[PDB]
Amino acid sequence: ANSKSAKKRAIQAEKRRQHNASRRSMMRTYMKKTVAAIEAGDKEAATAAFAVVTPILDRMATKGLIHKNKAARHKSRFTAQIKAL
Amino acid sequence: ARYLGPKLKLSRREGTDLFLKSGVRAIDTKCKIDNAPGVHGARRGRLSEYGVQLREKQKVRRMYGVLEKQFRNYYKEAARLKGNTGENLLQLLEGRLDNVVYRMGFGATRAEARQLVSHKAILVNGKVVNVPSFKVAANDVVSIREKAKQQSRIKAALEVAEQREKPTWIEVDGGKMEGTFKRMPERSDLSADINEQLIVELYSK
Amino acid sequence: ATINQLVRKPRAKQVVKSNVPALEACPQKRGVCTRVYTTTPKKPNSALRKVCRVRLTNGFEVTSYIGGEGHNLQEHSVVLIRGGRVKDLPGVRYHTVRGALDCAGVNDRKQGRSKYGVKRPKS
Amino acid sequence: KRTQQGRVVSDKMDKSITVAIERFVKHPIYGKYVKRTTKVHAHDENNECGLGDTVEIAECRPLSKTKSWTLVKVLEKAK
Amino acid sequence: MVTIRLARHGAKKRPFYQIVVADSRNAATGRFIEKVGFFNPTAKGQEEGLRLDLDRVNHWVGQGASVSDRVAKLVKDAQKAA
RNA sequence: AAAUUGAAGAGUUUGAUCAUGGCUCAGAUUGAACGCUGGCGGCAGGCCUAACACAUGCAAGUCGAGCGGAAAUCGAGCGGCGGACGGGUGAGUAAUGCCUAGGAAAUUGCCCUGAUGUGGGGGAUAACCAUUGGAAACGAUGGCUAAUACCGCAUGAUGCCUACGGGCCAAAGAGGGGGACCUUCGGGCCUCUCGCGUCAGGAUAUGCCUAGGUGGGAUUAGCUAGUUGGUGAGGUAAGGGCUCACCAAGGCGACGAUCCCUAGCUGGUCUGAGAGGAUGAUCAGCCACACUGGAACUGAGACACGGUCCAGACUCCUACGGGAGGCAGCAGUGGGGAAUAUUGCACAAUGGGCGCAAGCCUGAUGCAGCCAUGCCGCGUGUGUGAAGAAGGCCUUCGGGUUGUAAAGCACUUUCAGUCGUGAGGAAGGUAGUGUAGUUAAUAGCUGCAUUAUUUGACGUUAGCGACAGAAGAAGCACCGGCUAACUCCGUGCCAGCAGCCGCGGUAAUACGGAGGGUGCGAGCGUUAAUCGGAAUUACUGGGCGUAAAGCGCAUGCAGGUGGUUUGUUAAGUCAGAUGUGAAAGCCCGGGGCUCAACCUCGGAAUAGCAUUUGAA
């Protein structure tokens, strides 16, 4: 990068990438836990996992890591998919 | 540019008087007017329609001392303007300041008129105009700056213009050395020797 | 032609052709003379007409006329060519611009000098 | 309610009518009025319509790659 | 954001400004939303120095349009004109 | 009121003719080039080629009122915001773009409006210090520390999910001032300012969809298999084969699919009586691209010109281990080319970024330089002047002509020159003071005035005066016909000319010179190129017995067209309304520059499309 500012932006963007990746990774891990249980079939364990993920999804939506709409989608789908069990 | 070269030569080609000298001596006494310029001057015959048109166009240009690019623009305006393209063209040429200071008599020729205009001798509505081709409108007052009110060429030219017929569309107090362009001339007011029709026709050809 | 015929297949625009294809729609073109020779006109006409084969910058080889009396063009002269058929000479579609690059003005021309590259006589 | 009428011209797709809409246009050059045809894949939920039927369709959201029209009403069924 | 600002037209040494509503991100002399007036800084004779449709100005300000300092001063001048 | 007033032909086929029919010419135009020539000004324009390669400088920063600090009110650092704009280019793209008109399934930083909050905690980390790797680039290791950096917890509904019934989610302080109450005298405490969260509207911006329109080729007729549709899942801001699995066999195409060639699109521009034709510089809108190819990251927004990563070609540095770079930003260089400019000045103005502001930054932009590249204006003198000078040229040797031309004699002095004067572009900034709001407040803050003071790159500015003197300022093409303008010499089918027809082989108005003339004029010619003329692709507006042209004849699908009549419908048609058809341009009226170009106000126009109401 030519300018000092460009060089900084690059550094910052890296730290943010690392941060976002960690958070995304986690939110995904907790989503996979719901998905696992809905696939296994366990209407209890599914709701349990879903209670862990709901805050995370809503938090990450406000903190920008995902959109509100994406949180809604996952929550809505997951709810149907458990109720379905 | 302005055509700077021998004047009567032009009149000889056009076969007429263009008034390029003050009319103190008759054009015939200063030149062989009935012969064209040059060694083939006493040999005139068939001109084409094109030549006939061309001559008429040149007659009018040379009278008013306008070059082609300007003259063609005048035609374009005369056309754009409402009504008679031929008449419009003449009233455009007649509305020029260098012509208007000639018609009033401040200049003995249209070329002296132009020098007067260029050299900042002339006011229009009390402002100094030194553009020959400025379009004097109706009820405009062309005057002479107090500086130039003492130029004897001007006094001269007033008495030269006494020798001509008066413009009935221009009023002049030559004592106060100011004139009013009362109104634009009609076709009837001007020379009927001019066939404007041919010039319109030339600029379709 | 009926309207319905014209609706089915409209009237065809006509492909025009350039007489000066080598210029490639440029006003002039530089080339190097490969041969400077003379050729005889098509008959009714009789002369020895000074021409040059020229390799242009766009890689065309063309024959250009060398107009006016006398010229200084050897093989390897760098000339500018313009458009212009010579009616007499079948093949010649270009003129060599006299008075431009290695081509010199026609010596001791005094009318139409600009066409032949000759400067104004110091009077 | 800017709908467009037309005629079913295929029905072989599941839940999809191809409908041929027909415009009568003055020719830009030659002045003659000319039949021109827009085909427009519409959506038919119930597989109601059949090849030949005259239907009224309406523009909607994209329902597939090529379907952004929907069957309003069948106007006249085929012989 | 939407801004009310001067857009230079006219000729070299003879600026003539259109007062325009525009997205700020545009070039001042490019894509504008609405022309709301003009400002001739060197107007003579009968030629108006400042036309400005204050109603339209207010409309846009009420929708969160900024005004440039210059247009802000011409708004005052158009109000001392009213 | 007006928004127009518009339409020319000629040459050449023959012994001659009339037709047919090419070819050619006169016009207008230009991002031109070239030749000759060249004074000034105004306003525009200026790599069309090599999306070739690029030396050098510069084109994106800013904030100390976020933070620890301190190298010298500020470097470096953290953090915020910007860097997605502005600027460039047209390579790709023939429709995933553009234009027009709709649509539904979206998001949208900054801004505005409204409503709500903003509690209580935590762990880090750069800078720094210590040590150490490296030639450098760039690192490493160990301590240290702050925040509007980051994280949890609390809290939140008019948010989101939920069939309920419920469940779930965030945030940040900083600065100015101060009455009283407090004060461990730090501050709490009040008020205002600038910030912080969430939600809802608005605005703006953008994504997505549809229809119609938007080159050439049929000596390119089949094309497609995530292909076309369905179901479900995933995925997205959002609908959707967007993706996958599965089911079905669809889909497109002679109203030209597919393929190939070419190409950024539009407003417009040029030409044209128009209908058309041609075109897409400058200006403005949209799109695409950024050494080539790929990729995402960060973010409201990028798959990012001056960011990241990877691969590649190239260039460079290297201490051989390893590094560095991307002018299609502005100047500029080389190269290519017929051909296209300064390594300028300034942020004064208009904007843009950041900032409470002051400001800082800004090759955007304003200006300046260069070039007759274009348009427009002006000048290069005016009048008088016959011996009709001389000289040149011609001559019937009489004369004619150059030519009132020159000289001479009176004048004038624009513009150049010199010296002076001298607008306008400037809005603001700062500091007082007062006021009027806020507020506990004669504080602070914000506005309004008012005083003082400061802000112009252009710039020795335009504009004006004053001088002195015609003084400093004219070419270029042409003169056989077309086509305005003719003679004499030289030449002798040579030399040469030429757009076409042709000209030249001894009295050449065609070659070359001269005299004279014609046209145009700071230009004039040539070449290239577009339209015109060309009714010569004919819709307007042509033809086919013999000039080019009726299929050898027929049958016939698609298509085209279709008798009479009633009713109905209203698709075509017609009329009107509404929305839209950007601005600029064009046109008509004005207005402003001494005029003009140019700038500018209003209108007309945008012949269309959508919706809608009528007529039949």
Tell me the C-alpha distance between B74 and D13, whole Å: 72
Tell me the C-alpha distance between A75 and A69, whole Å: 10
DSSP assignment string, chain B = ----S-HHHHHHHHTS----S-TTS-HHHHS-TTSPSSTTTT---PPPHHHHHHHHHHHHHHHHT--HHHHHHHHHHHHHSSS-HHHHHHHHHHTBHHHHHHHHTSSSSHHHHHHHHHTT-EEETTEE---TT-B--TTEEEEE-TTGGG-HHHHHHHHHHHSSPPPTTEEEETTTTEEEE-SPPPTTTS-SS--HHHHHHHTT-
* Identity at B92, one-letter amino acid code: L
Beta strand pairing call for E2-11 and E66-67? parallel
Tell me the C-alpha distance between C33 and C72, whole Å: 11
Tell me the C-alpha distance between D7 and D17, whole Å: 9
Tell me the C-alpha distance between A65 and A56, whole Å: 11
User: Nearest nucleotide to C112 by CA–C1' distance?
Assistant: F477
* Identity at A14, one-letter amino acid code: E
Count CB atoms within 10 A of the CB of residue D5.
Answer: 15
Handedness of CA B47, B52, B54, B59 (dihedral sign): positive
Q: Single out the residue of B96, B184, B87, B90 nearest to residue B139, CA to CA.
A: B184
Sheet of strand B127-128: strand arrangement? B127-128, B122-124, B140-144, B178-181, B170-173
CA neighbours within 13 Å on the CB side: how many for A50? 20
Torsion angle of C-alpha atoms E44, E45, E46, E50, degrees rounded to 10? 20
* Identity at C79, one-letter amino acid code: V
Tell me the C-alpha distance between B130 and B134, whole Å: 8
Tell me the C-alpha distance between D22 and D6, whole Å: 7
Tell me the C-alpha distance between C89 and C43, whole Å: 10
- What does DSSP assign to residue D20? E
Resolution of this deposited model, Å:
2.8
Strand partners, C22: none
Inter-chain CB pairs, C–D, below 8 Å: 12
- What does DSSP assign to residue C115? G
Q: Could you identify the residue written with the tokens 């021309």? A: C109
Q: Single out the residue of E32, E45, E40, E47 nearest to residue E77, CA to CA.
A: E40
Query: What's the CA–C1' distance between E31 and F178, in Å?
Result: 50
φ, ψ dihedrals at B117, nearest 5°: -60, -50
Close Cβ partners of E10 (under 8 Å, ≥ 6 residues apart): E16, E17
Chain C residue with CA closest to D34: the answer is C7
Q: Single out the residue of B196, B127, B114, B112 nearest to residue B160, CA to CA.
A: B112
φ, ψ dihedrals at C22, nearest 5°: -75, -35
Tell me the C-alpha distance between A22 and B104, whole Å: 96
Q: What is the 3-state secondary structure (H, E, C) of E10-78?
A: EECCEEEEEEEEEECCCCCCCCCCEEEEEECCCCCCCCCCEEECHHHHHHHHCCCCEECHHHHHHHHHH
Tell me the C-alpha distance between D78 and D19, whole Å: 14
Strand F nucleotides, any atom under 7 Å to a protein CB: 4-8, 24, 32-39, 42-44, 60-62, 76-83, 85-87, 102-107, 109-112, 150-153, 156, 159-163, 167-171, 197-199, 202-205, 208-214, 217, 228-231, 233-242, 248-253, 255, 276-278, 283-286, 297-300, 304, 306-308, 325-326, 336-339, 349-353, 364-368, 376-386, 388, 393-394, 400-405, 410-414, 424-428, 448-449, 464-466, 470, 474-479, 482-487, 493-505, 512-531, 537-539, 542-544, 559-561, 571-573, 582-583, 587-596, 598-601, 610-612
Torsion angle of C-alpha atoms B91, B95, B98, B99, degrees rounded to 10? 40
Q: What is the 3-state secondary structure (H, E, C) of A17-83?
A: HHHHHHHHHHHHHHHHHHHHHHHHCCHHHHHHHHHHHHHHHHHHHHCCCCCHHHHHHHHHHHHHHHH
